[PDB]
Amino acid sequence: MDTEALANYLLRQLSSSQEYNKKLLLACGFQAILRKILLDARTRATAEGLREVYPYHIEAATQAFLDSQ
Amino acid sequence: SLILDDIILSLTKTTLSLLYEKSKQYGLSSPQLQALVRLLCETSIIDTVTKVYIVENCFLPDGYLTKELLLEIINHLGTPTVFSRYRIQTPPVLQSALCKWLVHVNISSSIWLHLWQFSFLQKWITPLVIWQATTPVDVKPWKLSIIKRCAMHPGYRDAPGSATLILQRFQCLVGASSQITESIITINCNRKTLKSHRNLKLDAHFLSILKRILSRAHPANFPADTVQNTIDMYLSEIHQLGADSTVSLWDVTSLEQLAQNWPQLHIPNDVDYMMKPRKVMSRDSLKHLYSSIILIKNSRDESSSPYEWCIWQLKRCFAHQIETPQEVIPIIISVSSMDNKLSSRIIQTFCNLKYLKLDELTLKKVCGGILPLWKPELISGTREFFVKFMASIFMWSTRDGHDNNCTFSETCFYVLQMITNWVLDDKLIALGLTLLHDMQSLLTLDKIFNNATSNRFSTMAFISSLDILTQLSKQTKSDYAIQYLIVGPDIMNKVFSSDDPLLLSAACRYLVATKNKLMQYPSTNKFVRMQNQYIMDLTNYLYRNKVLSSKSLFGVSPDFFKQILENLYIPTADFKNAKFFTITGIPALSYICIIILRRLETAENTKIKFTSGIINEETFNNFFRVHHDEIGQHGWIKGVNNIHDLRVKILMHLSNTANPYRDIAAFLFTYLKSLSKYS
Amino acid sequence: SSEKQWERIQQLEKEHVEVYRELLITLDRLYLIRKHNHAVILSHTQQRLLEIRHQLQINLEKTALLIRLLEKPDNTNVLFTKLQNLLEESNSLDYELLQSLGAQSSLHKQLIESRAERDELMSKLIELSSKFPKPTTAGKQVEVEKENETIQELMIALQIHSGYTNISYTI
Amino acid sequence: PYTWKFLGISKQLSLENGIAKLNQLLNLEVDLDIQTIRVPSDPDGGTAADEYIRYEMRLDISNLDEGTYSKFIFLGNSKMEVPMFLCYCGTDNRNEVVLQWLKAEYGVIMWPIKFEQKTMIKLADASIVHVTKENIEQITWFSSKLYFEPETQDKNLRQFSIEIPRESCEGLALGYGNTMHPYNDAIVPYIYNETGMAVERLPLTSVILAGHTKIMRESIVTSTRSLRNRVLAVVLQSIQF
Amino acid sequence: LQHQMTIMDSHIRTRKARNKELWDSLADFLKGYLVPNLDDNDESIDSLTNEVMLLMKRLIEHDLNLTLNDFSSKTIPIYRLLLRANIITVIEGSTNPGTKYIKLIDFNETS
DNA sequence: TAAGTCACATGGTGCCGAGGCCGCTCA
DNA sequence: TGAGCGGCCTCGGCACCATGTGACTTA
Secondary structure, three states, X not given: OOHHHHXXXXXXXXXXXXXXXXXXXXXXXXXXXHHHHHHHHHHHHHHHOOOOOOXXXXXXXXXXXXXXX | OHHHHHHHHHOOOHHHHHHHHHHHHOOEOHHHHHHHHHHHHHXXXXXXXXXXXXXXXXXXXXXXXXXXXXXXXXXXXXOOEOOEOOOOOOOHHHHHHHHHHHHHOOHHHHHHHHOOOOOOOHHHHHHHHHHHOOOOOOOOHHHHHHHHHHHOOOOOOOHHHHXXXXXXXXXXXXXXXXXOHHHHHHOOOOOOHHHHHOOOOOOHHHHHHHHHHHHHOOOOOOOHHHHHHHHHHHHHHHHHHHOOOOEEOOOOOOHXXXXXXXXXXXXXXXXXXXXXXXXXXXXXXXXXXXXXXXXXXOOOOOOOHHHHHHHHHHHHHHOOOOOOOOOOHHHHHXXXXXXXXXXXXXXXXXXXXXXXXXXXXXXXXXXXXXXXXXXXXXXXXXXXXXXXXXXXXXXXHHHOOOXXXXXXXXXXXXXXXXXXXXXXXXXOHHHHHHHXXXXXXXXXXXXXXXXXXXXXXHHHHHHHHHXXXXXXXXXXXOOOOHHHOOOOHHHHHXXXXXXXXXXXXXXXXXXXXXXXXXXXXXXXXXXXXXXXXHHHHHHHHHHHOOOOOOOOEOOEOHHHHHHHHOOOOOOOOOOOOOOOOOOOOOOOOHHHHHHHHHHHHHHOOOOOOOOOOOOOHHHHHHHHHHOHHHHHHOOOOXXXXXXXXXXHHHHHHHOOOOOOOHHHHHXXXXXXXXXXXXX | XXXXXXXXXXXHHHHHHHHHHHHHHHHHHHHHHXXXXXXXXXXXXXXXXXXHHHHHHHHHHHXXXXXXXXXXXXXXXXXXXXXXXXXXXXXXXXXHHHHHHHHHHHHHHHHHHXXXXXXXXXXXXXXXXXXXXXXXXXXXXXXXXXXXXXHHHHHHHHHHHOOOOOOOOOO | OEEEXXXXXXXXXXOOOOHHHHHHHHOOOOOXXXXXOEOOOOHHHOOOOOEOEEEEEEOOOOOOOOOOOOEEEEEEOOXXXXXXXXXXXOOOOHHHHHHHHHHHHHOOOEEEOOOOHHHHHHHHHHOOEEEOOOOOEEEOOOOOEEEEOOOOHHHOOOOEEEEOOHHHHHHHHHHHOXXXXXXXXXXXXXXXXXXXXXXXXXXXXXXXXXXOEEEEOOEEEEOOOOOOHHHHHHHHHHOOO | OHHHHHXXXXXXXXXXXXXXXXXXXXXXXXXXXXXXXXXOHHHOHHHHHHHHHHHHHHHHOOOOOOOOOOOOOOOHHHHHHHHHOOOEEEEEOOOOOOOEEEEEOOOOOOO
């Protein structure tokens, strides 16, 4: 499932070429949010020592992220 | 054809159909393919479904694909970027279909690898970069870094499985470029997507269309079978991916290379690779000639590397060390069938009882691959060694109690072929003929070759020996001794008593040949009367029916032969002493004459069929008695009135060019004054 | 169950012919010893004639009750049909034996001539290989070759990724 | 978990000379070690011509795992039909470069080694006898597990294992008597007497010694960092002609 | 071999030639296609091309002082083209954060 | 400092339901 | 040519023993 499929998801959520580029940049930003959140989740899991992450880890990470945003 | 590029220049509906049918009949040339793809890519007035129909149905090459066609195609596979906006974007489905058509048919490897970063091309670029990587030096850590970076990159679909396939091919290819299996571990571990990627379909209807077009194309340039084999091996390379002043011999790629640097050629000590086994010239392109090149560069002696390799890989086969003792056995056979020193060394070190005990199948194969070509270096001592070897293998076969074991007979056939090779040369012919006599003595012993426990292997070896004797007797220019064509009476009467029709035919052939040789010899010698005894006994047993009146038959007086007939009950005692001592009374030739009689009845469309299942005088008389008025006018074989005429008419049909029993008919037509006119 | 009957009669007839052959051999050597005292060292030329009289007695008996069963075709006994099956499988493969033997003999002649040609070629090439003469900084060379490789690969990357419309093999 | 791949060598190659060429080719110094071991020290296993030559080639860079610790072990005896075999652990890509250099320098013929059933039993016998610094041999008992994968029609019996605990194995050995080959003399005859299975005839894929090693038909993987002398010797008699 | 015996009875130059050919082919490519398609520096292609050859020469020689500072605004599309090739390492300097040290990946290693 | 006991955290073999593609397969 | 059942088989979740190492104690 490519990034263009996520752009299709976003356009069907909101419903030419320049708006396609805008939505593609939006999909890239969404992937950046997910990657940063998962990186914070691993950082906190390694801080606690657990090999995997858990829902409370990533909930705390995303609350700390949205606190700054 | 000119219609194809005429339509191409016209395009610069009817034209499309004409191009399709002329491609399906002739196929385009490489400049024609260049012009067609150049016209198709640059314009966009042509429909895209017709574009993919063209690239899947019209592009049909005739010969080599030139480099200029690939360069022109590569110009069209690019994309508009910030440094190139004037050129229009080629449709991605057209690019993917063109790459798929490329699948259907050091710089260029990097060209195709840098085009692999395109997302839509990845489903067909991967076989090209697999097939380009043929040498370990082709791969490099920068290629691995780019492949891993694009593989683990998001936004792609086919990149994980296909790039895992690329990395698997690289791991199977180089065995270097420090370990990359953990990089494979970092990429997907599903074994499903690359499982579907490792087998690829090429639209076998289009493959058959190109097959027939290319078969219509150039003689001795892409024949159909080699094209199918090349396509099959290119697909199997994808399929089995689951598991400076002097020049080295590896880097030599063409026959032109060996000339100017033969005194500057360095042969390596990498014997296992160059002896264990493509349109590109590489190290494996000239792998066939490496074994001979070593023995030319280093003068022939029993210390060279191919000799040691053949000896070691044959000892591994004998000791059951190799898993598959059928991949290197043809290699050893091909190397050592020639090169007399190696074959003689193998014969001296392996043709004995000890290695026969270890594995008789591999010994049988190496006897088939070495013995028929061997010519000895030392004449003395070869005969005694071969008698010892044949005696050892004969005891080994006969102690088992199983008469199905045919290794002794098969190796005997091989050494008779060696004797054929020996007697083809005028020198050392006495050794070969004496060895032939020893083999005839071993073949006729009643341990394998009996009248109850049959062995057609021994009969085949015997008739092979008789064929070689007949072919030897026709050579006038060789002054061999007269005593080496007889085999003694004890073999000849025994094989006359044997009930094998092919063997009796071979014996008659041997008699015909040895009499035609013996006619210029004096009429009264030690062996002329021996041949006379042979022919009189065989004619009396075959046609005369006068066995009881003779002095002896096959060295046995007819009183015992009559006493066997006594106490031997026959249902009808009309003609008992002459019923079954003839051509129709021989055990090997009884039903054969009935088959011949039935075929003669069928050929003449006779309404009367010989109902009795035996041809004898009593049955013949009863058959004429039951249908006398029908026989008298018409409805049976013409020109026959008695049993002797029936036998002559049978002998006519055995002399035709349809049976392997020519020689018995010629024997009866030769040494019988009554039958001398039927020759 | 008929296949069991045919298999059974097959090993019975195998043991039958084996025991009859060895019985005939033992009977004849018993006659030889009983006429003599201990003469058992008979030569090969006499043992062979013993084998010959054994062979002619065997095939004479085979023909003798071949006369008994094939003279009048009853076409009802299954032994009769067994005889035609045995005969039609015996005489079927006779021509293919000699055909394969002749073809493989022609193959052997091809082996002989190919070996002679290769012996001549090896002799000539050993004679020529003894007439050739014997076989006889780089710090910046490897560096400039590495520079050449890097420059040409960068040239390939710049030609492809920029959309330049003339890709060619530039040395 | 260090898998040892075994390859035989057609010639007795001497490694104390020419290894500087390998050092120059690999741009790193290797730690070649020379030893002269005498493995069948028992009187019933032979008392003459028992000496072997043991080479321990080691691509030494760092010591964290087998990615930088792909060892090479060579064993040799000049009084044999086949004079040398090698076994190497790890998964580094430099190992096949070492094998290619060994071929192209010494002109040797190298083939992979496959173990038979009796060879695997003898290897399990060899891998418990441990040599001590006091020059004594100690049998360390391990709970073995013979593991079979038979091929039957319709895949009726895919696999079956025979687990033998440690104390039962030493009880069988003491029941047989004072012997130095416990598996071939006590364990396997007991299995044959009890269950009717001749494990030297059945398809035996691995015998697993719990915590020490688990040898297979084509590889030997050991928890211990090295391979003892008895296993190397039994492999050397395994490939003889 | 008979022919070679009859003939015989009676290198660095192409390496440097190919090096100079690659140099002049790169020069012609950059002075005719890439910079004119960039159409920057008020159509004064050679003035920008001198800096482009300086950066390429530093990249080929593997200069350790290469970074994002010496790349001008006109060379930003050229650097983006180089980055799209995936043939360069983009690593931020530990001593100077924010300065991305840039060098090509090794095209000659046989590890 | 060599050896031992300990819980601990990761490695690993075996097992099975879900589901997918394959593998002919037959009308 | 086209739908179609069945062995395969791998994903992966679970279950359990197996295992190597640091912390701590004993001598």
